[PDB]
Symmetry: D2
Subunit: 94 residues, 4 copies
Amino acid sequence: MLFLIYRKDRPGSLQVRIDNYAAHLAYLEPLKAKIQVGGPTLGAGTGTDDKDMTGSFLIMEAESWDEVHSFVENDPFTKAGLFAATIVERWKHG
Amino acid sequence: MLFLIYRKDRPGSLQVRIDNYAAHLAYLEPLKAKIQVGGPTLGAGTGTDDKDMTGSFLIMEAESWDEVHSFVENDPFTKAGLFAATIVERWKHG
Amino acid sequence: MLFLIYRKDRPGSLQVRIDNYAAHLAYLEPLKAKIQVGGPTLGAGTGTDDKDMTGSFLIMEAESWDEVHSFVENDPFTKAGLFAATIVERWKHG
Amino acid sequence: MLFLIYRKDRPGSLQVRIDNYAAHLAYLEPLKAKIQVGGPTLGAGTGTDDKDMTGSFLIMEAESWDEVHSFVENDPFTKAGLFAATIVERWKHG
């Protein structure tokens, strides 16, 4: 199955994002082929640098909701309390 | 610029989606170039057919927030009153 | 019926909120009797002043989804394009 | 601090809600005095009974984001894997 995974940072938790970004990126690495599209949501302005990140979006291939939840739970970002909003949706290409 | 566009149907409004899906697809058609990813969110169970659709997701290229809002507003789905939730985010590939 | 009405400002649009706050409050005034709970969402830190506003939340009584949706469309804040996210939910007290 | 806590059930998990509702409510009971508003989101139609529930909304007083997140995590509904979406927002009465 495919899932949308949409997560928005707590307001001014930017530092938590920057401090944990490398670990989060390393966490995604072994899952690459299962991750079809992924990248950070961005804030005010037109900047696309690290300081403009406000959250994470991914489309994830997984065999169950249990798998997705467990993937979310063990994200370094999740363990560090970075997120204020998390939305997960079963999904398909159109 | 890249934008996440997330919309969820009002609960109970599947038929509104069904009756208007063709018009919705026709509206998206000229924009194929600008749309990097597209598809519906899906509901309960494991089915991936039309009657499982519960919403719409796009990643789209646009020059402004104005352009994105205009695109959202002119969707046949919008005027049809289909959506109870709309989320737009500026976004980039990781 | 009762509805949750949840709206988040577009990042960087604080100025649009300031410019339209008066008209927005004017718009809510006649409908004061239908609004059970109302207030702005807040951003980073612990401040609770105008400059801390990041969005709008309401619990409102309406006779139908059409009434709620129209109430949302006619908001000065809507017509000014302040919001990046809007979520409406049918709801009841516990 | 006041927080909006918005949580939507995974599609088709109504029976998980029904089976655990009592344990969820007993969880909320000791914290009654910190909760200003609470009740479930409702789905399609106009029914307002148990089978209509689709999520949980709360406005709650807490001393920190970490307290809110710990509150949420220890909810019997959380541990049952009921929720697909969770949104938390710092907030104030207008």
